[PDB]
Design a protein around this ligand. Structure first.
Ligand SMILES: CC(=O)N[C@H]1/C(=N/OC(=O)Nc2ccccc2)O[C@H](CO)[C@@H](O)[C@@H]1O
Length: 411
């Protein structure tokens, strides 16, 4: 049970699935603002998750000894993403929009953590590849996957690695972490038994090297690699080795015949966790009747599930090292309406149940600071000096008073 300092140093992350579904820059700014207000440290933004919803200004890709022109890559990606879900609200964020988003979050002490999913959840990239002349990028098992790249297809792999590298190059120097996903390999084509299928066809070693290369690409570009736990040391076996520097976003140990590594086992291999507990999931539009991650359950679970409790473990009987925790908003059915206040209420309850971990609200202090002769310059200083930047969410009134004193002095 940490000191105030340890508690505040942990990441508090709100995750938004803008891979499946379009979110405007304004919508994401409002999320950033609300995250800042409630005391979160980061917004985790999925840009590639099924749909690919982010184009750089220059999308020229070099791979397979060949060159794929920027205009063609954009067109193919737009077609890929539209084939997955032609969202009426928009298709993809631009490079200027994400740059502005990052610079807005930074002004509020909020990090951005981008996620570009592969080799699963990459519907949009698969079709984009077909459009660029890359035949059969899809995994084939019980049927031809719509979500997952064939690991035997070197043409497709090289392209995707080049694509992901250009994304990484953009986020280099702008964000600390890059999440490359790897959750649910070929779920759609194996009845959600993808890992078993990879092991069956002796392609799991091939998955690992793919995962290890993305990890290496991230580190080389000065980005801390992150990935979902699913495909790491599946079934607690270690004949296939994984990069030990990946931050594991741990969400679940899986279900009958989806026998993921335990958090105990990954901690024994040296891993650090971002606690992305499935208990906190909310899928837009999910009703109580539907079961699963509906709003009332997620809200209840921010109460029942301790901040540090990794899925499948009881806290504190099992106490594993985490850098923080992440509450996740998903868009499984992307035509469900995004209701801002649902997300806000859920964000609020997670903060309200963990006040020791969340910062106080510094938006009014910032607003006041940017408003700035005699012994009245002496006063403005003594108020400036009395500012405390270390206050948690339990101490908002204390902060309000310090801000009130500084307002007084500036008048
Ligand atoms: C890492 C993660 O949360 N992956 C998927 C996800 N996986 O949740 C599962 O429980 N998936 C699952 C179901 C059956 C067998 C194996 C995995 O949940 C979110 C909400 O449904 C989806 O948006 C995600 O894409």
């Amino acid at each position: 049970r940490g000191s105030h300092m340890e508690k505040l140093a942990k990441n508090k992350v709100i995750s938004i699935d803008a891979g499946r579904k379009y979110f405007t820059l304004n919508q994401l700014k409002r999320i950033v603002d609300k995250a800042s207000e409630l005391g979160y440290s980061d917004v985790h933004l999925l840009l590639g998750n099924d749909g690919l919803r982010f184009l750089l200004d220059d999308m020229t890709i070099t791979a397979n000894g060949k060159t794929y022109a920027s205009d063609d890559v954009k067109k193919a990606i737009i077609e890929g993403t539209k084939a997955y879900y032609d969202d009426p609200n928009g298709t993809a964020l631009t490079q200027a929009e994400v740059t502005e988003l990052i610079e807005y979050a930074k002004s509020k002490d909020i990090g951005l953590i981008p996620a570009i999913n592969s080799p699963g959840h990459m519907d949009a990239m698969l079709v984009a590849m077909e459009k660029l002349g890359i035949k059969n990028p899809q995994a084939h098992f019980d049927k031809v996957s719509k979500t997952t790249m064939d690991l035997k297809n070197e043409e497709a792999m090289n392209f995707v690695k080049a694509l992901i590298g250009k994304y990484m190059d953009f986020f280099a120097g702008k964000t600390k972490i890059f999440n490359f996903g790897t959750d649910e390999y070929a779920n759609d084509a194996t009845s959600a038994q993808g890992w078993y299928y990879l092991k069956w066809y002796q392609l799991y070693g091939k998955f690992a090297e793919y995962a290890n290369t993305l990890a290496a690409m991230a580190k080389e570009r000065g980005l801390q690699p992150m990935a979902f736990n699913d495909g790491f040391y599946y079934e607690d076996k270690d004949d296939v080795q994984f990069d030990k520097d990946v931050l594991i976003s741990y969400w679940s140990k899986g279900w009958w015949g989806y026998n993921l590594a335990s958090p105990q086992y990954l901690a024994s291999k040296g891993y650090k966790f971002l606690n992305t507990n499935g208990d906190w999931y909310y899928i837009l539009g999910q009703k109580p009747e539907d079961g699963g991650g509906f709003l009332k359950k997620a809200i209840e679970n921010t109460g029942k599930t301790p901040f540090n409790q990794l899925a499948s473990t009881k806290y504190p009987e099992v106490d594993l090292p985490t850098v923080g925790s992440m509450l996740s908003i998903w868009a499984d059915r992307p035509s469900a309406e995004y209701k801002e206040e649902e997300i806000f209420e859920l964000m609020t309850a997670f903060a309200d149940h963990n006040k020791d971990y969340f910062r106080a609200n510094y938006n009014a202090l910032r607003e006041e600071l940017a408003k700035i002769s005699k012994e009245s310059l002496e006063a403005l200083d003594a108020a400036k000096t009395a500012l405390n930047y270390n206050l948690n969410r339990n101490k908002q009134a204390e902060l309000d008073t310090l801000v009130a004193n500084l307002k007084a002095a500036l008048q």
